Symmetry: C3
Amino acid sequence: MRLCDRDIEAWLDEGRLSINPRPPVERINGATVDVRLGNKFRTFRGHTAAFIDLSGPKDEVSAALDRVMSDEIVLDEGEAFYLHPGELALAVTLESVTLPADLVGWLDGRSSLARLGLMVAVTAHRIDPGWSGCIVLEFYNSGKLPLALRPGMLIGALSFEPLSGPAVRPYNRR
Amino acid sequence: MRLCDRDIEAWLDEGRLSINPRPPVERINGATVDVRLGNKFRTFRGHTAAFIDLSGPKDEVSAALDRVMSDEIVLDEGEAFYLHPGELALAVTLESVTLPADLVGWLDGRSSLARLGLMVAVTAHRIDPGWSGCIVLEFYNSGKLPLALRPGMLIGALSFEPLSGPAVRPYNRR
Amino acid sequence: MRLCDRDIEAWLDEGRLSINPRPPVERINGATVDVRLGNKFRTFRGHTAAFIDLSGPKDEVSAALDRVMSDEIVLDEGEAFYLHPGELALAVTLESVTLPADLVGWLDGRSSLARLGLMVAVTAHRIDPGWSGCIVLEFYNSGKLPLALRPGMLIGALSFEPLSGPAVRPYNRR
Ligand SMILES: Nc1ccn([C@H]2C[C@H](O)[C@@H](COP(=O)(O)OP(=O)(O)O)O2)c(=O)n1
Ligand SMILES: Nc1ccn([C@H]2C[C@H](O)[C@@H](COP(=O)(O)OP(=O)(O)O)O2)c(=O)n1
Ligand SMILES: Nc1ccn([C@H]2C[C@H](O)[C@@H](COP(=O)(O)OP(=O)(O)O)O2)c(=O)n1
Ligand SMILES: [Mg+2]
Ligand SMILES: [Mg+2]
Ligand SMILES: [Mg+2]
Ligand SMILES: [Mg+2]
Ligand SMILES: [Mg+2]
Ligand SMILES: [Mg+2]
């Protein structure tokens, strides 16, 4: 059952849901909180590696993630990151988000951007009970033209769903 | 908490959820209402523009949407729209949908079509409290062959989730 | 309203949700049950067909699915399936899943894999009330390198949502 805008505001006020920085009324509507584009980007540089083995522990999958992804790319004031057709890029939300053990988050991308080819998780839109941090984003340009993204733009929408009870093993405790 | 088929039928009957035209019992099952393909299509013609700037207000993002997308394409009786591999196309549901301030919709594409490469929102599957209208669809052909789509085919599935309370700023009031 | 880990464990214990084989505590966390990669794969071989017509009954859409998809591919011990950039492949979960008429499932892919290009449903992540069986998976490699998948790896995450009441026409009864 999704929280409506007014109840998102309630859970924020009680300190049971945290979002930093806290988005104003303008960005809390219906059943979502708008989220923004951060300033840390990553792209592929595949030439060092033949493939990526996706089986095997987090450490292998994370070691791989860094052997083939570029250095962090931080954009100045003004600057846009251009995501070219058929490219997969990694980014991050501006907002940090902390969920309690009895809420689950869902990130939607924006539909108006999807229509121009911007694909955002997509595969895993779930923010877990106990998640605390920025949300890592994967973009895919499914469109015909390059898409310019600037830090601070609206990039997605969080909605929040109470669980049937507080989770015994939330993200933070494992 | 999703409405089951019987309760979708209830909310339709009370006039608290509206779907036009109203789908018969055949198309209301489990926790979804089947939706159909409309008859308004759009494709990319990128050659006029170098890129699309996705930051900046709706009007810019919508101005862009029309500078680079084709004219509306309306298909006769018989006719199919062929969505070619790697193409992003825009379409619309046959059904209009109106949600009240205390329901949120989710559009799924059909799994049997996804298996042949048909990707449908995907990024933003959320229909908001207060949404009233057709649902704009983005298709992406992730497969190897062209996919023929005909107006009237089943194209997706709506499910409906009550909010924790009626939303203070639903879509219609902003 | 999603079941938390403890309540997923409850519904499993009561025999109201079934997952075979039953995943241990390690794979039931927050609001999800981890699911694994099975051992039945399929790829496209498009050269026999010009297109696929996606309108027309299940039997046509399923006839098509077999005229253009390869034979079942079963991988030995050791073996990896390599999903190459821009390829759409079909697979299956290791676990069989049975839902009752008053629960709906959602499959997420894993975010750490999505970041390396692994796209999993994506378009239809919904497991219906009354669904009983393996879950068919479509993968898409949106990344730059090939991705190696091995049977038994974690491939996704199931979450479960009670309906507003038991569904009158669940999947099994139609
Ligand atoms: N695939 C979709 C998804 C949403 N919509 C509709 C339904 C929603 O109430 C609105 C807003 O969706 P969303 O917030 O993701 O779009 P914006 O880019 O913020 O305008 O558009 C649609 O027409 N087609
Ligand atoms: N990725 C998926 C999604 C759904 N399924 C299963 C689970 C659901 O109960 C059914 C129906 O899903 P869906 O309505 O989207 O598929 P259809 O094209 O209408 O047959 O198939 C699956 O095997 N793999
Ligand atoms: N697009 C996303 C999705 C999830 N996350 C966060 C939120 C979740 O609590 C975690 C776990 O997501 P998930 O189980 O799909 O990822 P793993 O591959 O299992 O580590 O990561 C994210 O940063 N970006
Ligand atoms: Mg919005
Ligand atoms: Mg998602
Ligand atoms: Mg269906
Ligand atoms: Mg979606
Ligand atoms: Mg996980
Ligand atoms: Mg999905």
